[PDB]
Structure 1
C-alpha cells in the first residue's frame, strides 16, 4: 500500500459506480478494474488486456507470466522481475511494455526517490531489449525484419514499434537495423541506393523509366520489364509522392502569389476560384487525415492528437485566415483590407516550407533547436514590449505640452519610439540619450545571450537521436497518404468516401501472421534469449567490485 499504483487502484475502485447490491459496502476487486487502470496508464491505442466477464477446475489465461511480470513491475520489485523475465514468452514486446509503463508511472510519482529508481529500471529494460534485438538481428537479418511488424496477441493486439514510439525509446530506435528497415520501407518498391538527383531525373521524364536508366530491387521487375507495373511501383514509392506533393505545393504557392499580386479584382476571376478549389482539395485531404483511424480510439482524443500536431495547428490557422479573407473579399467595400488579409495568408503558407528540412541530413536538428528557443522567445517578447512602451510613454510625456491629439501625437510618438527601438536642453538631452544607450543598447541583448546560451547548451548533443526518432511519423503519413497530387486527390477521395459509404491498415506495418509460422519465430527468439543471457552475466562478472567480493 505504500506504492503509487495502489493509491491509483483505490481511487478507481472507490469511484467504481456499478456495484449496487452486495452484503458489504466495498464490493470486490475484479480483474477488469486493474485492466482499466492499466489501459489508462499504458495509452489509448491498445485494447483492454483482461476482458470483463459477461456471466471450473483452474481458469487459465493466455499467458500467466505476463501478468506476473505486471504484478512484479508495478511494485518496483527489481530483482524479482529481473528473475522472472527470463521465462518470458516474447521478451522483446515485454521489456518495451514494462519500460513504457515505468515511464508513464514515474512522471506521476511525486516522490524524490521512487521516480529515480523507477526511471533507471526502465533504462535497464531498454538495454535488455536492445541487447536481445542486436543478437537476433545479427543471426539473420530478413527474418528479424518480420519481428517488428508482428502484432502481439498477448499485449492487447499491438505491435512493438508503435509501442516503442509511444515510450520515447530513444536509445532503442536509434539502432542501425531498425533505421535500415525504415529506410527500406521509405524507398518503396525499388532499390534504396539511387541517391536524390536521379530520383528527380526520372521524375522529370516519363519514358526514362521504361528504358534502362534506373534501379530496381525485386529483380522480377528489374529483369522482366512490364512498364505499366513498373511505373505503378515507381509511383507507389512515397519518396515520389513526397516530391510530387512538394512540387505541386510550390506551383500552388507561386500561382497564388501571382494571382494575388496583379489579378485582384472585385468580380471573381477564374484563377481565384482555381486556387480556392486547390485549397479546398487540400483541406479535404487534411480532413481525411482526421477521419482515418481504424484503431477505434477516442475521436475526441483523435482530434486532440491532430490538434496537438504543430504543423496541423498552423495549417488550420491558415485555413481560418483564408476563410476570413475570402468573405472579406466578398464584401465589395472592404477590398483593400481583405486583399492584404490574403497577403498574410501567403505568409502563413511559406512557413510550411520550413517543414521540408526535417528530411535533411543535418538541418532538422536546427529546426528542433528553434522549436526549443521559441518557448522563451515568447516570454522575452512580453518584457521587451512592456519596456519599450514604458519608454515610449515617457518620451511622449517629456518634450511636449498636454494635447488631445489622437492621430497626430500617437503616430508621431510611435514613430519616435520605433526610431529609438530600431537600434538649456543640453543636460536633459544628454540624460535622455545616455539612458537610451544605457538600458536599451546593453541589457536585454545580454539577457538573450544568457538565456539562449542556456537553451542551446542544455540540448546541444542528443538532438541527432531526436531527429532519428522524429524521422518515423512523416514516413507513416506518406505511406498513409495516397499517391495523387492535391489537384487530383479527389479521385481517391470519392472512391474512399463511397467505399466507406457502402462498406484497415497496410500489411507492411501491421499483420496477423500465421500461427505456425509465429510459433517457429517465437521458438527462434526464445532460443536466442538464453544465448544473450550467458554472455550478459559473463561480462557482468568482470566488473572489479565482483572480483573484490570474490
Structure 2
C-alpha cells in the first residue's frame, strides 16, 4: 500500500526491508528437524520470556541517565532535533560502549552503574533459567517432533509457485460437495474384535509381572 503511494516511496521501500528480516527467522524453523540443534532452540524460546521484562528495566534506566545528563551538562535549550538528537547519539555512544570533579563523578557513576549490576542481574536470571532446563530437553524435542510431520503430511506436494494448481482442484471439489487413512481409520468390526481380544489377552500377562515385581520391594518383605 505504501509503495502504491508515490509520495512515500522511501518510506514504503524501507518498510519492505523490515518484512525481509522477519523471513530470516522463519528459516530458523528448519533447525527444529535436526537431531542436535532443536534442543538448543528450545532454550532460546525459553529465555525470550524473561529477557523481555529485563530489557524494559534497562530502558527505564537509560532514560533516567539520559535525562540526567541532558539536564546537568547543557544550557537552557528547547531545540527540535539539534541538542536532543545530539545527546541521544551521545547516549547511544555511551550505552553501546571546574569540570574535573563533576566529570569524574559523572563517569564514575556511569561506570559503577551501567557496567556492573544489571550484568549481574542477567547472570543470576540466566543461571536460574539455564539451571532449570536440565536434560528434559531431549524428551521435549521428541514430543515436539510430531506436529511438524502432521502439518507436512496434510500439505499438498507442490512448491508454492505451483500450489495454486493444488488449490484450484480442492477449491472446486469443496465447491460442489476427512483425514488420510494412515493416521486415523475406522477399522472393520470383525477385525476390531480380534484386535481387542488380543489386547485383553496381553493385559493379564502384564499384570502378573507387575504384581510379582511389586512383591520384591523390601517393605513388603518386612511386612511379611
Give TM class, smaller chain. over 0.9
The alpha carbon displacement at 1:366 in A equals 1.2
Determine the C-alpha separation between the residues in 1 that align with 2:98 and 2:184.
Answer: 83
The alpha carbon displacement at 1:472 in A equals 0.2
In the alignment, structure 1 segments of 5+ residues that lack a partner are: 1-326
Name the Cα RMSD after superposition.
Answer: 0.6
2:12 aligned residue (325, 334, 338): 338
Question: Deviation string for 1:90-127 (max 9, x for gaps)?
Answer: xxxxxxxxxxxxxxxxxxxxxxxxxxxxxxxxxxxxxx
The alpha carbon displacement at 1:549 in A equals 0.2
**2:28 corresponds to which residue?**
354
Question: Deviation string for 1:224-281 (max 9, x for gaps)?
Answer: xxxxxxxxxxxxxxxxxxxxxxxxxxxxxxxxxxxxxxxxxxxxxxxxxxxxxxxxxx
In the TM superposition, structure 1's runs of 4+ consecutive aligned residues that sit over 4 Å from their partners are: none
Determine the C-alpha separation between the residues in 2 that align with 1:430 and 1:343.
Answer: 43
The alpha carbon displacement at 1:423 in A equals 2.1
Normalising by structure 1, what TM-score? 0.41
8 Å CA contact 1:357–1:363 kept in 2: the answer is: yes
8 Å CA contact 1:365–1:464 kept in 2: the answer is: yes
Aligned residues, how many?
224
**1:397 corresponds to which residue?**
71
Determine the C-alpha separation between the residues in 2 that align with 1:470 and 1:356.
Answer: 14
SS of 1:360's equivalent in the other structure is coil
SS of 1:521's equivalent in the other structure is helix
Normalising by structure 2, what TM-score? 0.99
1:480 counterpart = 2:154:
yes
Determine the C-alpha separation between the residues in 1 that align with 2:70 and 2:36.
Answer: 49
Question: Deviation string for 1:36-86 (max 9, x for gaps)?
Answer: xxxxxxxxxxxxxxxxxxxxxxxxxxxxxxxxxxxxxxxxxxxxxxxxxxx
**1:430 corresponds to which residue?**
104
Question: Deviation string for 1:422-442 (max 9, x for gaps)?
Answer: 121101111001011100001
Q: How does 1:196-235 map to 2 (within 5 A)?
A: none
Which structure has more helix as a fraction of its residues?
2
8 Å CA contact 1:423–1:441 kept in 2: the answer is: no
Determine the C-alpha separation between the residues in 2 that align with 1:437 and 1:424.
Answer: 21
Question: Deviation string for 1:486-540 (max 9, x for gaps)?
Answer: 0000111010000001111000000000111111110001000000000100000
1:492 aligned residue (158, 161, 166): 166
The alpha carbon displacement at 1:335 in A equals 0.4
Determine the C-alpha separation between the residues in 1 that align with 2:76 and 2:133.
Answer: 52
Question: Deviation string for 1:141-177 (max 9, x for gaps)?
Answer: xxxxxxxxxxxxxxxxxxxxxxxxxxxxxxxxxxxxx
In the alignment, structure 2 segments of 5+ residues that lack a partner are: none
8 Å CA contact 1:328–1:338 kept in 2: the answer is: yes
1:523 aligned residue (194, 197, 214): 197
Determine the C-alpha separation between the residues in 1 that align with 2:48 and 2:180.
Answer: 37
Determine the C-alpha separation between the residues in 2 that align with 1:484 and 1:509.
Answer: 21
Determine the C-alpha separation between the residues in 2 that align with 1:345 and 1:404.
Answer: 36
The alpha carbon displacement at 1:460 in A equals 2.2
SS of 2:162's equivalent in the other structure is coil
Determine the C-alpha separation between the residues in 1 that align with 2:57 and 2:121.
Answer: 11
Determine the C-alpha separation between the residues in 1 that align with 2:128 and 2:152.
Answer: 36
Determine the C-alpha separation between the residues in 2 that align with 1:496 and 1:475.
Answer: 21
Determine the C-alpha separation between the residues in 2 that align with 1:490 and 1:353.
Answer: 23
